[model samples]
Target chain A: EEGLDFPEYDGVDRVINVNAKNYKNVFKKYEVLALLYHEPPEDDKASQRQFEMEELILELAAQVLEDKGVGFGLVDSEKDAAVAKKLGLTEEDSIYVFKEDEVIEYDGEFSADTLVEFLLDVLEDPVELIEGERELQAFENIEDEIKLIGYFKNKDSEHYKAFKEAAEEFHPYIPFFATFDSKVAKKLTLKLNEIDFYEAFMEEPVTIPDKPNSEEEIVNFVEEHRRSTLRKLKPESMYETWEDDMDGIHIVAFAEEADPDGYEFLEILKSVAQDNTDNPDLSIIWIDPDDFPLLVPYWEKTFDIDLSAPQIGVVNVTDADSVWMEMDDEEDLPSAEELEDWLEDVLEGEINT
Target chain B: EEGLDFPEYDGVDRVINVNAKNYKNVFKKYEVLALLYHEPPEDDKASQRQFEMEELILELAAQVLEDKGVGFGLVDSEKDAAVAKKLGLTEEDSIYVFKEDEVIEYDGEFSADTLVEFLLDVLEDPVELIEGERELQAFENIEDEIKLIGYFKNKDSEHYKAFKEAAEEFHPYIPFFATFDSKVAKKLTLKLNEIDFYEAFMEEPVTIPDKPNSEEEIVNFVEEHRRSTLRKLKPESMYETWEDDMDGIHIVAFAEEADPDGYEFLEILKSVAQDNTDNPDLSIIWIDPDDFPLLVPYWEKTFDIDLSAPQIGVVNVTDADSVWMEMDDEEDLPSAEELEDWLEDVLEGEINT
Candidate 1:
């Protein structure tokens, strides 16, 4: 089921060779749909622009996942025109990144560092990728790290282009997703062609200002909105706004509004959440006991425990709730370092996030 | 499945395709079943018959195995008249080979070097591969580098040529195989075609000379059978002269007179026989308790136990067994390093090998 085809006696790098008889078996259980367009190398071809660029692009892309034992495949397009078609190659030698149905074409430079980053752009961020109208539950799915959702009616204009350029700058950390379907988002008359940015554990969403006066200012506007350790339970609006936040672990703490230690614990939880807002694993949040009322009683009954005022429980939203541990009940809650250790154990895989 | 009918991304070499309304899932599970029939090259073609005599042959064969990982599906012959009716092809552009029910045909070379080696050679070598009629007890089941078998009679010459060739080549260590279909073995008169070889062990049966040659030479001929680390087992054997080959680990030792250090350790016991030259876990074998009579008693008295000896134990014959470590205690055995490591711990695949 792995993509290896030959036997290697040592730690040497190798490329895959696919043919008409075995292509179907390539991604047996992986999410890779990577492609590299190459023209055969001329003798001493590294000096040739196309050859140099293609190898650089491919080598850079290959460096990311394949070598580290990740599953995405970086394919050579010349040997398999069929695979190239599925990936979006025209009559040209170039790079193409395809994930499920989303395709990111390459019109950019082909330097290794540039292409590697481009390939990683597809890998590190998935928010800007939630196309179409998204619901609250879908938003919860992406509530990790930071997110920026854009509302634009035109994808071709220079305005959309400017927003995209800014999006690229903050990528990997805060992915910017958009939808032309403004009605689905319903609030904020996105008539200004503005964007909404959300972060981990914050109390509310912040909207980027009206159309950019300068490309540089738009990026600053976006960055300001990236700070938040906000709680999901605090959101009465747009959880769908951060739907692609897939941090590996989510921290939920319950604190009382009238108790200082509880309040203090919540503050620490806030800072911890903020610190990991851009982390792929571990996000922390604190909820007011008043916020859950009924859900509190339900959880207490479900776990057969007293509904204590100060508490933090870490759990997976799905997966039989692949919880990290029976909720940690340390005397003073856990320090940022302690919580990080917990996250490391739970984040112990290449997947999940 | 028949491996084709898919397109590739530009410059990609994705493997062959397999699918549907009963695709024959070609190659079954062979490392490969290669093919080599191509049209000559032309100027502007997808390129053509470079016939430098490498690519197509190697590619066609390589195509069968090691794509994504592996598969089978040979193309049908072209130029041949009714071939169109055979492989579901029309404007034929190549030669073909089909195997299972019937041969599509064979106008290609039957010569040994190119086609024979081409069609039959495997890139990997197993310690040994044995073939012959077998009996329950006569099996050395050696599961390892030791295989000693005796035989007379040729199914025919074609069989002998191929078998003998394979025998000589891989023979430096692994003893090749054969057998006296006890019945046919009796009349061999192994005269016209004599067998020459030895350095091994096995219990009994008696070699063949048939109606004429030196009965002693026949006996001498079989002593030549001592080719493997074979044990001259005291048990009667058609064991089919080396059947039940459950080709797994065969624990072989020379007990008391044979040796327990004195036949003392060999018996937890045996004349003992069990089924499954085919069990899932592991198999047990013993040469002859009688052969170790003195050691058998010495052992019985030693362990205050029952006795049996001059035996071999086998299993995980391939993988776990592939492991050969320096000999260890009888209680401890010299397993192939990996298997011992395995049993000592493939008693650990993390999947039963």
Candidate 2:
């Protein structure tokens, strides 16, 4: 009987085939993906339901990644022979090789921060180069691996010149640059951490362009201008911090160049501030371009300032720059009422000081 | 300024105040018998949903007991505010004491079984006597503690006799009694641990009641009658292991005093055998009532019986008792077609030793 050659088992490894015909049929029809053989028995209804739900979630994630044009594959169990075929597997190939890197070893103890970091690592570019003409030569000889490409494609465009002029006018009034003091940065960081800075900044009201006709039309015009300006400036980094005394909604946008020409960006910032004054839930602060050079010196001077006790300082970066004075504890920052009142005073030329 | 007679300021505890007021109102209106508290954050959505489901189940059980004319009290959580006031609590009391022995502990991890056991234990009379009977002496001693009272005046009533007989007959079929056969019992216990026996038993076709007015019903009727008559003559201890190998729907009766002898309790086996024999799935095992006593011994004598094998055993305590065997290995038992063929041969008297 052992010497008999069965036609059904032709081209098969006889040593491994106890039920040769059945084994050959099974092996010929499908490739094994992942053999999750240790599923809690079908008798445990609760475990079965949980496992089914988990499998559904995995399927959904895999579909979402594929829809987004990402190349990836999922092998949940032995039954997924079709999926294994799609992933370039033959019927006779074992699925163990694919399992080597795909299996997630969960230790079951992860903090919120660690989880967020892991997700960020998976979704974000590993490194981004800070772009500027001065920094261009430094990267000339090196081959880019994980660097963000930057180009000064539209630096001298009309939108860029307009933004430069606006920046120059509003730079003086910005709190950080008015004082050019490190104390403000430290205080801002502490306050931002206390509240959620990113959420507040993202929700800030957009400035509708006044020169455009209708609100819809103006919004489109503003978006176009904003998009074009963004391309020219090509911001390498955007840091935001909140103001503690301003009910957590006040946001300060910090950047290295302070809008190169300081015209159009400053105008947009001022417009946003004016239009959103009615919202009562938003405020913005832009740093001064003239005072950018003084930040390092001022920060060193005030490095030892007592954090518990508030201090007021005025550092003049230029004759046209604004002055800063620390408000008393009893003085509240501009509330909606105060903003309305200030707007009226500015319109009447009484709020120049 | 920190002078004599200066009262100390108390810190405001908002969460405690909110939870306390809410719980107090719930207790007052719902007569909540217990309050459960969990760590730092008192509100957990999943735990709360589970607690609510359990509470509803308990209340339903209590209502069932009351409908059966059992004496019980609906515990009050709120109206006795004086009790909580006396306790001088900042937070609502988490445990409510009901009557002397009935204390409802508000623990988060109460399992379904534990809750059922608690309800049963609380509903049981403190002193054991015949059910539905009132003891004048016992009543007088604890009259104040009794919230309600019921009396079954006639000790020899048909209802009483029927209930007692049914209870005695069904007692042996309880899985708890299988411990008498230590070897088989141990193996069965291990198999049960590996799979949920309740779920498996529920799935078996034998446990499915015969289709009403179908051939299955007729067969079930005969089988039920045969099993019931057999049970009456055999030792009650063998009820769990007695396999009902018949291929028919078992019979059952909804009426009280199942037999014409005026037994006022439901007699499932006898009722099924007598009434429903014409149904398609109805087939009764034809065996001498005297031989029924040999049921367990016969099973022990035939085949290498292993409790570890998924085996179905049927005992006809009531007309409703029809359990099929399940085996761990498919090869150990005959296929469905094979079993049906064998059953047909036996019913036709075509094959006999």
Candidate 3:
């Protein structure tokens, strides 16, 4: 059933069969691997044809990709049975590609061209973490997995620096990623949720009811609320949605997090925001006030309110003579809950602001 | 659903919509019809998009098939629901085409091109019948059924003109077809044992332990000698197989209809040919002796035989000086079971001059 070694005469140009002896050095050198699991040659017609087809594809893949620096080789799955089992090779003649992980599967139609096109696509998207060229092009393609990134602050300050190290146990359950000093700009925000200050946030039930207490308690609470209700937004990549429904008003949230009360209130605002999504008169949006130039003066003129950091309020995203239902000082905060009726009025176009 | 009708729109050049009401007349006219079963439109975005994709393909199919003379149409399963139900089109969107009897399914990728290519194939193969172009093609394609075709001896024959009428009961079970005098050159023969026959011919088979008799006894015996076995002979399209196997010899059969026993011998020859197929020293072949100039004299001189209307034989298709194993006179007729050894020896290259 096993230890079916590679044939002597089948030593062709592009494809080679590396056994347990040579598999280590070859696999180590080859980051991009296409492992084809297939039976060896047979004395009959159909089986022989099948054996040739598998060899032909591997030869083409190795020839084409090797010209572009790919260390492509085939495995004698039958002969190297233990190695095949280790690679989890299943179906005979099935091919699995490895770019760090099972990058893609050669499932449907394939040829040398199949592997060629795949190789070109792989080459085209050169994730070169190039240290010498000073352009990090080859930084490994992330396999499909939900990641929690840590955007670290300076080593001295935060209660969260211990987070990444402490959360090592959650590695298999959830990947923990990081980028030191600042944001990775793109969606490498997993580390951003842990290390950076403003975006240093986890989703709830990952976020318990109150401001998280300390390093030990936070981890304990996180492990506690590991799997809870999904009301906490899944943090989709934020972008401006259609203006058709809420052209006149936006149900806005601004909370100055130095007071962290606004943060709690923003949490509750999201709780009810879930129920009020059908209330189309107002748009659900909450970005930093620093990102708003006109909204600051507009809120000031409407409630004479201060442009606070963690501030939550509404703004007329459309009205030329701009205004917002704002919360000025402490008493003005009722302006938040009153948005339900305020939204309805805007939906009905009954505004005399 | 039962009495629904098509819209002004549902009818176009190549394609049309049909209900239980108009489906009968419209589907009747077209020999090659591609019936696309699909859902109707809706209000919302996603559902509306899905509905239109179905319409887009249908419209394209109609446009293409119509230009090439295929009757392609849509079925509004929403309103003409029962029509779809009766057609047994359970899938949400599926295309089925009917041409006289062989109703091909559009299970491959369906598109304007799909219908266009199908339309071309259907148009090229003209089904010319003047006893009225008739309602035969209107029936749904039988998904899987064994078909029987009777190649008539003459249109005036006593049993056969009545054959079509008598076998109406078998229509739902098996499709019955015939051409004016054919030994139709294909695999269309099956269970014709009941409606027609050339003669009773069985070579041997344990044939001496009993002899089969009568049309009724045939029906009894065919239903009796049901399960048989075969060996060795690998069915091939007769091309360059291993030239190394044997370039030197061939095992063959040559007999005409006047000796239909040779044909019956072939049927049982194939029955056990399976077991001895691995005895590949010689090749198997059958040819009409008249098609060869020397074969007639060779048979006459070698086997003291005659080239009658229907005969079976073998000859080296390659060599000019051909040597065929002669099936000589009656006492030597290799009763059915003996042909097993006969074919084996021929395949084994043990033929005698």
Candidate 4:
């Protein structure tokens, strides 16, 4: 008998009793509509169905509001209508409706005090009681927003300290909160409040190593590193001798002179150190026989150490037979050995000696 | 007595020949009266009287020209006659007529060419043939009647050479001859031709004897000169010092702070050099403290010098203090005695050491 039987309950008893008391609160209530228009009047078409539909909806809304004992009024006159028209609304398509009990009355002119008082009344809160709390919340939200925007750090308990740091950092560029719009500020505030500022602040500061402390160190390091790397990779007797010069150390390698693939030497150097990303301050001067004199002045001017001085050395491809002469006495040509010695002295930081 | 009465019997023969030629020319011309009108198609009594007188003059002029076997014709159109009916003409206001041969024909596009050719023909010589020798002589008598204007010169000629040199030396900013028009070229050529080139070229190039050739000499010279000049014309002191870490030398002498009448010093410098002409190469930099940092990069990029180097010297001055710091670690600051010694070294060209 129990297996064949089924139990039944009343629908009213199953549904629990609920009322407005269980509801938390109303978030907000306001009518909003998308505003669209053909920017220039001449471009608008009266026969467009969408334009007609929008007009009909607006008229119906106005009539409904009027029937509900809420005042629905068009602009005062043609002049007012014309002004509204410029702001993308025409008398034919504009919606005019008012909410009963939403029209806030104030004795004073339309100003900050009157507007704020009206909002407080509509919000069903005492103006003086909520003023300070509202302002504090607004400031908190702003601080949160800046953190979310990646311009500031978020902290859980020490929000004021985080805000101070953010203000200091952003002050020079954008000194005011008013620079951002209300909607953007609200969204950003919510995002920032959800982050952990303490962790972000404790993260490591970015490190960018300073340029070489001394010219001698820069020259020596670049030369030794480049020479050793070149020798290891190219050991087929295809590599030319490395020569030190007043300008810099030059590695000349010859794969073939007739149809030389020597450009690989330069391409390798560029990949290793000549590029600014790898070595930000290094300057590579490509030397040709004709460009030697031009490069001399450039080096002398840039370093403020005359490359044409006797203390500095000049080097060229021995097979190429490029000439090296002192700028002071253009006719005084140094022997290749003497030039090499001068180059060694400069590269070794023995110029003063 | 006969010599006194016929004072210019010598000049009288020339005058008699000129008078005979003018008389023959004047006798070949005649006058003809034409009717004028006040209103067309309505003849007034006074207008008819004026017309009769005009006809009598025309008839007399026709008879005279006929006797001389010269033809005279009038091609007055109906439009002119209608104008005549509106405004009457009198015998005294008759228009002059000349044989067609008297009026020169210009086959060329312009009348100027015909006029010039006619004048040459009247002078009885080609312009080129007469220009060298006879032109100046002929010009003396007819100087009032004809203007010489200006002359042209070939680029290789002495006059042209002088002009180019002067333009380079005195007006170096002027573009080459190809940049100028023919008229400007003619004027410049004429002016240069009237002046001596060698005398002008030999004048001293702008010399600043106070500014020495070597850097060491210049530093010593400026230091000593500043002391002497400051003693007499003490500039106002400022409390603000340029940031110590700034790498480059910054020289800022305010027009108001230096000397209210510092222009006098500039004038005296010009006088001492005996060269008062404007030098476009000279420039002055005046900027606020905020803009001072901008100059460091400009000098570095423009002159290709690293001011951070230890061998250089950086100087900064304000109303309160003047400081000079040598880039060298051990260089002695100049004492009054050392300054005098340095001055002797500078004058003797031994300061570089």
Candidate 5:
């Protein structure tokens, strides 16, 4: 004879169920924890069908955000009534992220992409509203991230709104700042509703040559200008590094996790990557040789070297050729100074594969 | 001190200028040739600036389509009047593709991505209208490509229009077909304004669960189901294979372009890939070891084998582990029969790294 049981709930949960016992610890563990204050599972098939799709959407987003160091949980309103009330939330079927005492609610459509974007926005406020000349000047001097400034007469205008909304898509990557001050706008010689992109290495900011009408146009402007100095080549970033329109030359370093020489070589490469942060034409990419086991033959053949240890090289994607630094000793890795000189020689066409 | 000279036009021309003498040979060389009939370089600064941007877009598209065996060129109306008149083209600022005796014109907006898509559409007629039940049944039985059939009451409805427009983006890849016959719709138990996706391995077609309101919904459905048997790992297809989605189990084969053993191994892998065309859950990927010369150390470390020669392996992306077939002989490569059995063992959990 069998007894009634909830065996389906016994497995590992992708989304943690937050209750009074675990709420405090979960909040403290993650910098930002988004909790879904949903009602109990529906019994009817019609409503359950819709809930199932929504649950999976949130679950997939939860899986993606796990690597980002953000937390996602589900709270049963009936079971965790005290927890929801303690947080001063009455809305059901809503999502909210807790950053200490501040609770920010997601009010957009329910989708994985938007949910991930909202969680990232909470983690990193990629956009800022510049109040006066001091802030505007400081933003223009920022050399790390690509910066864009939107000058509008009012904050409530459509163009300003579109500019702000476009910031969400690029959030936590490229920085987007807004300014409504007329005096600050005039200093840059920007007309009303004009958007300007600042390149720290360039002498002047480039204004949008065409009319800025939609959010897509503002997004396109940022997409065409964004660049990175150093990025890890993971499965996610593999295509971005190769297919980038702005930069074709990449400095590649292969490092291993367990080897001490690999560690020393990576530190040297990072130092060189930082030096060229302002240079948009060149990109430095780091790859863990352990992640891609099949590419070894190609690398060995192309570089004409034994990969018994770590190495560094420069690859011109357009030219389909590469040049690497020769390590005389197996134990000794090149210093930052030596790597930089080798890179300069490669750029001057002094080195060949 | 300088004479009248056209120095800017002295460099290499991306768009080949077609003329009466070379038109026949040019058309014969390429499977499809897109010729842009336009006026000579503009002298006015205002118009020249716009043309400069337009020319670059077309030039970049021409660069990308070169690998696809498509030709792009410009025909100066004044210089090649006889050639333009011979092709029955008189309009300036227009693009047309010539396929031997057949000539087709592009009427879409001018952009690199769209131009590439248009050229690809002309190369592969990916979409078709199912005239009767015999054609519909034959399409459903196709095992190589994913098929989607839209059943509508009329051919001129809004939903049908949206379905046809969405096919352009998926052209040369997924096959999209439609039928307006009510009798054909009733046989599949589909209502009016419905879409059904056929999987050759699956028992029945999966009708879209949600209400399809926009073309995006149809695209989303296809995105969720599309699969490939074997694909070359390139910069463009890198992200699609990883982020894609549907299948995480990948059979990766590394073969060199020059080596005889490498060529022999790739043929074995290709034969194996063909056997699994009906299985949508698995993907076989082919990689040229020489293309990515930097990944050698990682491959050697992961496989724990000397990658001086070609090899084959299975990678489970979700589990983050891999297993490869052991080759006892350095000179001899595995046959398709041996590869199939080893793949079966890996999928059955009989092998581990």
Candidate 6:
């Protein structure tokens, strides 16, 4: 019973079994590592089954994170007791994520999916270090996405620490870049200890005029302007303060991400939004109709437009008024100029129902 | 603004706008009526928008329950103020379910799906009334499903009330049939105020040995013997105490419910389970391979069996050992006798891997 390896775990070499002797070498090699500590099974039936299930969860999580540059190891609490004691590991069935000086124990629900998600979050670094012109150039050229950059003196500075703390708050969603070099900061026409917000396709970046504030201020600024003008409407984000984000009158372009015609229509809407960046009220929402099948009939009825293909409409949810642009053919998606004109007319109440 | 009806809502005849004059008549007509008390749209934009969204949610819920025998109506808090006050509806934007002598306010999330679910739960009566032989025959003839029945003197009895209260706990999942007539109870050889459990193919119904002292005692008894020997493994009930239900070793038959061959194999497994009802330890779990695509590869690897077609196996999760039946042809499902023999050998440890 002690050595009863299930046949399903034949090629589980990804989850390396680490002993006391080579544990330090394994730790030194990988920056981010996850380890499960457990005692070898005695013949006790119930505890043995529990141990097997716990190990299976870790193995499944390891398979998911195989190519994620996160090291996964299993430590026999008895055989590797010395290594476990050295790391303050007292619990038998506990898992820990080791990131440099940090040893965060996973106290989440014991499931493979949750474990994989926890490890992935730990693997994502809060901010990328941009030391030179090459790194800065590549960071700035990240297309179609907004980025947050902090030019700081060094890691020891209070502002830099606060910036890093804020970056941790927005990790894995907003790409945060930091520069410690004076040369890099000067090259970007920025002074030290300043934060800047940059959006793709925009020539000028918005910089915070003042410095030396709390992390809450930084969070507030990011929350206020973090929204992209043209974006997809996901189910999770649909009813979560979307009305406020879309403003009063918002343009909705229904398209499928997987289809060619939808892709073309999305590009057309994106161009229209990009060109009218100055018009802060012009919020264009892109929806993939396939995701919301129930809403499709409702939208079709509301707009009186055939949704067999991509279509665009401006809906004033506040006033319960909507105006849809008519098309002769399903393929006749609105061009950038045509869409801008339609938006202008709707804004002026010239072509509204 | 008060008359600003959105053009999209043209033929929404399902959700009746009930005023004070017709409110009581609407309530009296339908056994289960859901009435939303809301203020008329004021000239203010924010509250008006909120009212509109709330109305939209109710309308959507109405469409879902159009054929579910639940009535949907709206009460204007200002216009139908008397009706609102009569129902003690103090606050606006409140929805209530009216069953006879019972008023349950929905305090769950404000979404159309959740509202519909709440109403559907209210629509289902805890115990269905069975007055005569025709109803009893129809109820007993229900195929391939289990049912619970209680015979009582009348609804006024203490035992009958307790049974009805317990039935509420398992409502909408377990079909509960009740009878107050002494003739129907005598026809089924059941005495007054006795609870009986029946399965589809069972020759005899199991009655409680003695009178139930409390609702909890009846709940415990039902919980103990409620599980069918053969059943589908749903994702919700997968890891929630399934191991205890499975009794350490369980046979799994993988088949699609939609396919003909899969249907035939399921019937064969059902026949096997039906014959072995006395063998309470013989737990047979059914799995649709399509439901768990991730586990398919792992199961195939472990059993060394091609899962392109239906297959069956006995897995000892506690022992981490498994043995799968070999199929000469993809469609060669085991006969009831053959499956019973295999199960016997496995129980005796003669066929275990």
Highest-scoring model, DockQ: 6
Task: Show the colliding residue pairs in model 6.
Answer: none
lDDT of 5 by residue, A277-303 (tens): 566666666777655433443466666
lDDT of 6 at B316: 68
lDDT accuracy of residue A259 in candidate 1: 57
lDDT of 6 by residue, A12-73 (tens): 34677888778988898777888888878777664654565455556656665555567888
lDDT of 1 at A285: 53
Alpha-carbon error at B255 in model 3, in Å? Answer: 34
TM-score of chain A of each: 0.37, 0.20, 0.35, 0.16, 0.43, 0.54
By summed lDDT, the worst window of 10 consecutive residues in model 4 chain B runs over: B6-15
What TM-score, computed on C-alpha atoms, does each candidate reach?
0.24, 0.16, 0.23, 0.14, 0.27, 0.35
Q: Each candidate's root-mean-square deviation in Å?
A: 28.6, 32.1, 32.1, 43.5, 27.9, 22.9
Pick the lDDT winner: 6
Candidate 4 C-alpha lDDT tens digits along B122-191: 2221111123222333332231011111222444554344334333221111111211234443433434
Measured on C-alpha atoms, candidate 6 has an lDDT of: 0.68
Which residue ranges in model 1 land beyond 4 Å of their true spot? A1-194, A198-206, A209-213, A220-343, A346-353, B1-38, B42-353
Model 1, A120-191: lDDT tens digits are: 455554435334333433454465456666666667756667777776565444556666665645653445
Model 4's alpha-carbon lDDT is 0.26
User: Per-residue lDDT tens digits of candidate 3, residues A144-164?
Assistant: 122333444444435345554
Error of 2 at A238 (Å): 60
Once model 2 is optimally superposed onto the true structure by TM-score, how far is the C-alpha of residue A103 displaced, in angstroms?
21
For model 6, state the Cα shift of residue A273 in Å: 45
lDDT of each: 0.42, 0.28, 0.44, 0.26, 0.66, 0.68
Q: Which parts of model 5 have CA positions greater than 4 angstroms off?
A: A1-353, B1-11, B40-43, B100-102, B125-175, B178-353
Model 2 chain B scores worst on lDDT over the 10 consecutive residues at: B192-201
Model 3, native contacts kept: 0.00
Candidate 2: regions farther than 4 A off: A1-353, B1-18, B22-24, B30-32, B42-109, B123-125, B131-353
Alpha carbon lDDT at B177, candidate 6: 80
Predicted candidate 5 versus true structure: per-residue lDDT over B318-342, tens digit per residue: 6536787888642357778888888
Docking class of 5: incorrect
